[PDB]
Amino acid sequence: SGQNLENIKKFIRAANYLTVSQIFLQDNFLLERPLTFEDIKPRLLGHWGSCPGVNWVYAHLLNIQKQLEFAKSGLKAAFMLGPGHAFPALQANLFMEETLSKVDKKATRNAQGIEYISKNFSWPGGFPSSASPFTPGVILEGGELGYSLSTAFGAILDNPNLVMTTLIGDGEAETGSIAAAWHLSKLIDPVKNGVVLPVLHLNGYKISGPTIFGSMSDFELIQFFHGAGWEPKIVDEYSAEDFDLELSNAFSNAFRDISRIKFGRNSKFIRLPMIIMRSKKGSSGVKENNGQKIEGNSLAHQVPLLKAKTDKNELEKLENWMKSYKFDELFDYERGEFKWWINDFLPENSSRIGRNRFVDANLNFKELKLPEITEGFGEKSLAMNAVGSLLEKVFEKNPDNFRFFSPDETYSNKLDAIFEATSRSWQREIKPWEKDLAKNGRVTEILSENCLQGLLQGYILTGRYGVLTSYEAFAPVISSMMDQYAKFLAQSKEVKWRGDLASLNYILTSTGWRQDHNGFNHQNPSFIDEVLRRENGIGQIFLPADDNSAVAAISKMLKTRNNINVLVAGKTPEPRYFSLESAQKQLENGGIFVFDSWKNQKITDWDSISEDDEPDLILAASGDYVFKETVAALQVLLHDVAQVKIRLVYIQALCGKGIGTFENTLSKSDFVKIFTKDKPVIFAFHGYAKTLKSILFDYENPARIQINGYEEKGSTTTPFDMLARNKVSRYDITVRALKSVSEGDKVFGSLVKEYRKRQDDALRFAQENSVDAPEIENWDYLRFF
Amino acid sequence: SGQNLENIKKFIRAANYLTVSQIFLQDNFLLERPLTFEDIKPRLLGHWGSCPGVNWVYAHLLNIQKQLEFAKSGLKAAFMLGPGHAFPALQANLFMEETLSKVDKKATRNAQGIEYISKNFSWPGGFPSSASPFTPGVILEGGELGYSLSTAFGAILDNPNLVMTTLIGDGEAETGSIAAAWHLSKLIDPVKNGVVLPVLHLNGYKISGPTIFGSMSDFELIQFFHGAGWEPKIVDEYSAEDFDLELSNAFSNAFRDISRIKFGRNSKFIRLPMIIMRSKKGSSGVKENNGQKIEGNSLAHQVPLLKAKTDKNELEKLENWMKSYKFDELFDYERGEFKWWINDFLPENSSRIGRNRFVDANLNFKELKLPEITEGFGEKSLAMNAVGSLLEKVFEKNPDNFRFFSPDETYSNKLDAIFEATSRSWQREIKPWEKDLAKNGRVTEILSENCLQGLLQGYILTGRYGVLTSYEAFAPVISSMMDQYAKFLAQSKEVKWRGDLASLNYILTSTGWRQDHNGFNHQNPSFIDEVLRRENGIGQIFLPADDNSAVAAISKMLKTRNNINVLVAGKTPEPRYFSLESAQKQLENGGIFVFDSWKNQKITDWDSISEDDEPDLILAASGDYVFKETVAALQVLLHDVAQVKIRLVYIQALCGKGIGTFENTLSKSDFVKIFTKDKPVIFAFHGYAKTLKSILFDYENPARIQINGYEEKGSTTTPFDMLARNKVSRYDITVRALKSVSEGDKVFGSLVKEYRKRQDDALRFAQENSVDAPEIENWDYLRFF
Ligand SMILES: CC(=O)c1sc(CCOP(=O)(O)OP(=O)(O)O)c(C)[n+]1Cc1cnc(C)nc1N
Numbered sequence A, B: 001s002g003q004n005l006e007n008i009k010k011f012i013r014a015a016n017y018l019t020v021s022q023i024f025l026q027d028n029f030l031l032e033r034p035l036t037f038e039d040i041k042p043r044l045l046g047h048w049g050s051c052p053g054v055n056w057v058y059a060h061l062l063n064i065q066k067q068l069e070f071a072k073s074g075l076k077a078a079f080m081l082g083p084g085h086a087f088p089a090l091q092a093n094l095f096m097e098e099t100l101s102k103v104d105k106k107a108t109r110n111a112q113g114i115e116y117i118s119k120n121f122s123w124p125g126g127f128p129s130s131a132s133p134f135t136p137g138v139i140l141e142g143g144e145l146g147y148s149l150s151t152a153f154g155a156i157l158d159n160p161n162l163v164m165t166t167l168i169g170d171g172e173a174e175t176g177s178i179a180a181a182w183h184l185s186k187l188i189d190p191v192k193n194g195v196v197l198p199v200l201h202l203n204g205y206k207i208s209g210p211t212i213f214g215s216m217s218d219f220e221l222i223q224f225f226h227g228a229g230w231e232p233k234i235v236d237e238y239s240a241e242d243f244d245l246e247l248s249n250a251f252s253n254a255f256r257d258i259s260r261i262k263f264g265r266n267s268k269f270i271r272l273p274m275i276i277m278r279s280k281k282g283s284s285g286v287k288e289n290n291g292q293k294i295e296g297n298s299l300a301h302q303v304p305l306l307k308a309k310t311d312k313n314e315l316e317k318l319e320n321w322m323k324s325y326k327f328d329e330l331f332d333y334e335r336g337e338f339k340w341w342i343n344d345f346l347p348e349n350s351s352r353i354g355r356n357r358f359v360d361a362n363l364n365f366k367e368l369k370l371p372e373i374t375e376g377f378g379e380k381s382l383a384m385n386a387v388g389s390l391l392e393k394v395f396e397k398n399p400d401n402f403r404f405f406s407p408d409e410t411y412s413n414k415l416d417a418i419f420e421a422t423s424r425s426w427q428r429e430i431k432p433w434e435k436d437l438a439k440n441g442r443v444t445e446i447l448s449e450n451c452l453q454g455l456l457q458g459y460i461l462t463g464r465y466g467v468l469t470s471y472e473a474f475a476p477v478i479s480s481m482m483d484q485y486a487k488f489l490a491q492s493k494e495v496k497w498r499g500d501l502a503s504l505n506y507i508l509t510s511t512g513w514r515q516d517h518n519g520f521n522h523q524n525p526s527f528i529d530e531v532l533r534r535e536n537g538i539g540q541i542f543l544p545a546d547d548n549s550a551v552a553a554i555s556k557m558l559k560t561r562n563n564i565n566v567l568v569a570g571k572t573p574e575p576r577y578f579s580l581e582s583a584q585k586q587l588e589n590g591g592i593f594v595f596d597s598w599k600n601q602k603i604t605d606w607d608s609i610s611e612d613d614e615p616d617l618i619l620a621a622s623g624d625y626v627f628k629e630t631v632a633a634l635q636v637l638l639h640d641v642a643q644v645k646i647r648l649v650y651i652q653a654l655c656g657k658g659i660g661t662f663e664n665t666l667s668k669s670d671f672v673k674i675f676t677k678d679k680p681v682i683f684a685f686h687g688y689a690k691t692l693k694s695i696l697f698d699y700e701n702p703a704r705i706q707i708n709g710y711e712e713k714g715s716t717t718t719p720f721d722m723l724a725r726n727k728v729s730r731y732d733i734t735v736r737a738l739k740s741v742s743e744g745d746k747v748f749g750s751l752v753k754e755y756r757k758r759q760d761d762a763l764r765f766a767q768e769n770s771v772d773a774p775e776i777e778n779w780d781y782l783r784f785f
């Protein structure tokens, strides 16, 4: 114990020394000669206040892992860093562990490695100032605060004997996501999945002020964290005779309780332990400077000596601070290597914190077994039921690497068929009249969308599969956090040892065009714009036409890696236009369907399109309801005049690089063939008009393309009134097509008046009877298969 | 007591009867004859499960208001409905009291009014199914759950006699916004302000399953809500008499409130009480149907009898359910009015819940006094310091209707000058080394952005002013909720009795181009895209060029009403420009600056632009950090080649309707004069390129416009490296301009080679020295002063 404690103290001292050397020094890293003004970095970037807590937690975790390995237990520990601004200290904890030496050859544990890791911190072309995928064993960026407990819970599923210790700052704990994630222990069974160990760094200060949790006493914190499903233990630096002994006792007790919980079963609810660690912010640093308080104050957040390159007293303070660590007793200056204590302290390579096998995606990724797609049919299209049946088959075929997440909307979205295979995860009591609740359920349901997104991202980044479904309007709640994930993917594109990962799959349904029980608060198609905004080859939206297109698309997204895909489709009975082979060929051609109505010819290959024979007008649609309105308008236009030639175009997929998919994106020359250079193009969009305008900016002649979308209007009314309020009903589409072609009002005016009268009569019937007119409800639509 | 109890019971019986009549009946509202199949609505829309709790709370609130007015107390109570899907029951509570009759003449409290409110619920053209601005006394729609506590805390400020009772659902309490807002009592003093009263519905069930909070026992709930700084009380429907217990709870809660608000004896932290009530979901309704459980189960969420128009047993169940409420003992069928008992229950006029004076925007809105604008002094311009000084003057001049909100970032954003007027609100202990903390501070700081947005919207919707500042990267966290606010404004455009409101003002600074201490996670310019997507005349972005432009813009947004404005500017020492507080203010009438470099001529009136002489190319920028690069590129181009003519265009404001402001938006004819029809336009943007592409879709000839902006690339490096990574540096701009102008690549090949070599040398110097080259650091710019 005493030799053990001495080894932890030496490890902490060395980690602190390399942290300060990373922050300040650019030369004379070993301090063999007195410090001058030429051995200081020109710009003193970085942070210091949270580093000592990171060092203490990492060293105690290494000691605990060594003890567990001696006990011959199967538990493997991993570390998660919430405060991503404390990156350099963690870097030091890797350098003396030799994890970084397995990735970079220049980071060997010697004097050259010390110089390499000290000079290149925050340097242009060196290591970044924050956590990144370039760091081994890192899955959470920590830049945007929060999203730390949910990702830790998501990485623990289906990975027993894995203990993930995550560090959460007290200022970060004031966010909504962290506050909501405390209840995630009521839905996950730790015996068959694993244990998450939370440590709260209660330094007491934010960037420039005290914290909410730092103001609370010990009694209030105990009651708050025991009101949820946690068992908290508090250790404070201000009153402890020996801080490291208390930290060792707390970690040993927590891991003993974890081992006791794993070995055995209990027919009740579990209470995972957690550690609150209170310490002075920026401990073991400069105490005072220019009469102000640094240690134990919010002024230690950034660097505490901003003028060390020009002020003599600041340089003396920095030199004394670095010499307080006594690096001569740990390092060996003669040979340039560490002494014999570091080999005694560290365990073997297979059982170290930074090289956990359960967290790595290279040792856990497997292919997904796709069942045969059965394109069953009835009388009307029900895309959500078919998607649920296919996901039920997927759940049957892959019983270890597939999961489902939803914010209590599985029945409302017509995806309940998946309950024929698996139940919903629930660790609390079940009443006899309740159904679909089990401890080992593979569906997790909670109203906090942030927790669901964190669980999905943790499960995917560990190396497995998942799909998250939701309403379309409530998606942007997890908008910004999703963008963070995208950055990770971009930062994984330049790393040669990361490996492949499953795609991030969203199923957004119950769109605003058919919200019957709610009005104007459940219609917000802005999530797809945020998905399409990113430009690092990430972002795909799938726009099915019927149930066959829906099952083809949901089969396509499960075969894609390292991307983000969103599928938006309705859940109401709908007409059917395409069979299985036509839908599959359309998806393999990008997702564009072209039809000529004056000759009744479907075109699925862009070759053999006649230049001598071109359409007079183009009607294009994107989305199921707008496609129904477009085909109804095309039917009316074929009935009435039939002298002009109309080409019908439907788009099934959109990507950040243009029209179609990333693998097969429509080019600038095929757009000219599909869409004629000068003919008008009336376009109906499921979402905002500017979302399509941004994509169509880069294509040929954007002046003639009229685009109509949601336009942010509507209330609780009939579906036809909802379509007519935003000028995307069939009659206004026909009016626009008549006015866009030839003179318009000169010859086709009376038809415009007749169509407006028909729309007025339909709206009057809907207003008077609260149901749609029988002319629209019993409409006879077109067929293509 | 007993007379009051039976009057309350009669009120709740009437409320339940009108709620069911609103949900189901189309005719025979008084049930004079036996119910048939022709008196049922064709579509049964609405919700029922949460309505009885709303009715109980409203009746007890009215009783407690009458009892308060008996003793001549100044406290005025208001009601807030979190579960917005429970709208019809609240409507019933607005019918027996004559609040709805003051707005609508047809809603008079008689038989015709009963028919009017029952027939038109969820009808096309009638009352909506959810809460809306059309309802008097409503400031929160309740569509997106979780924004109820923070809005109440925002609306409760500077109103010492307003007590707001808000209803929160147990499923809604699982959202992170509510869990973050539970701690808001530690920053707002309830003696000089009002008291927010939270009530937890706790019916036990979500849409399709149990709730997390419903699974917790009483002991766990007591600990969780005591640890957060509240005084919870529990009443359950499984008791002898629910109404007597509820009345005792409300009476004791009001006694504590009056004993704490007017004595002022306590100087330490306070403990606001809250009410936790437990009841069966959909109480006093259908018990069983088709062998399933309805009352006390999640199946009572929507309509519990979905086939009452076709099934005889369902119709009989509905008739028995409605006849369970004996409406004959509360109504006179021949007179058509209520009996005398209601006149003994309702309090005096204007002492009623639905007509609170402290909540209405009318009778509380006052114009803001703008101090005189002053110019900036010095070579380098600091926009944030000038903005802070102007806000300090505003705080001085308006000591009762202005407040500031920030997520612990006002020191880092160079806005600390406002600390010369007011401190930060803080109700906890203050250390001797801590500064800018006071109980009566007018600045609220917490890391939860959702709480800040809720406080700002609550303050603004009651008829006062406020400004919220933040980083640009973490703004999208509050994107979607902001969209909800915009919808409110749109509905307020169609309500004739709703008064004016102050604009929603954002200041986002520390942009991604100058994140020195942070890396990739702190660059995300997507919030302005979310704001610009509103299409109801809402959404304005202000893009200052220097400090004078910043103060002119911040003076302009404080003079705008019923809108949303965003101001984005840097905080680094930047060169000054045309802005001398006079030319800048003249530019603000249009928001666009035009300069001709071949004759050194500024243009402020667009009708003076000569059509005979035209620029050879246009360099345009939007944002200060890239305006620097484009004026440097203009300087280099003027130095090297003089036979070409360059027109410099800067844009200061963008709106959803086009270029400029809503009051003065650039037309499609002025765009042709400013931007020539066929000349190339090299445009450089502060944010994403597609955000500007969507706006420029609607203008003339968008094919020739080369838009470059942030490309999601960068790391911890020098500012010039950050500019060059996204191809928006000065050398990139001049290379692009040379490529655009030149007919062939062999005329300016030496120049582009030289500029590429110069950029390579600058990047090499930055890589080797970690400091920008002296050629760039000591650059000499031009001025239009
Ligand atoms: C650099 C950065 O992004 C930091 S660090 C920091 C204070 C962290 O509080 P904490 O007490 O948990 O940290 P610690 O004392 O060092 O442990 C803030 C508010 N920010 C900016 C910020 C703002 N808001 C959000 C959601 N995320 C971030 N990162």
Ligand SMILES: CC(=O)c1sc(CCOP(=O)(O)OP(=O)(O)O)c(C)[n+]1Cc1cnc(C)nc1N
Residues within 6 Å of the ligand: A407, A408, A447, A474, A518, B049, B050, B083, B085, B086, B143, B144, B145, B146, B168, B169, B170, B171, B172, B173, B175, B201, B203, B204, B205, B206, B207, B211, B301
């Ligand atoms: C219709 C709608 O938008 C409702 S109602 C409702 C149940 C609310 O649970 P709670 O028990 O707290 O309310 P109560 O049953 O009425 O008492 C949900 C989940 N939703 C959809 C939904 C989903 N997610 C979010 C953030 N908001 C909403 N409104």
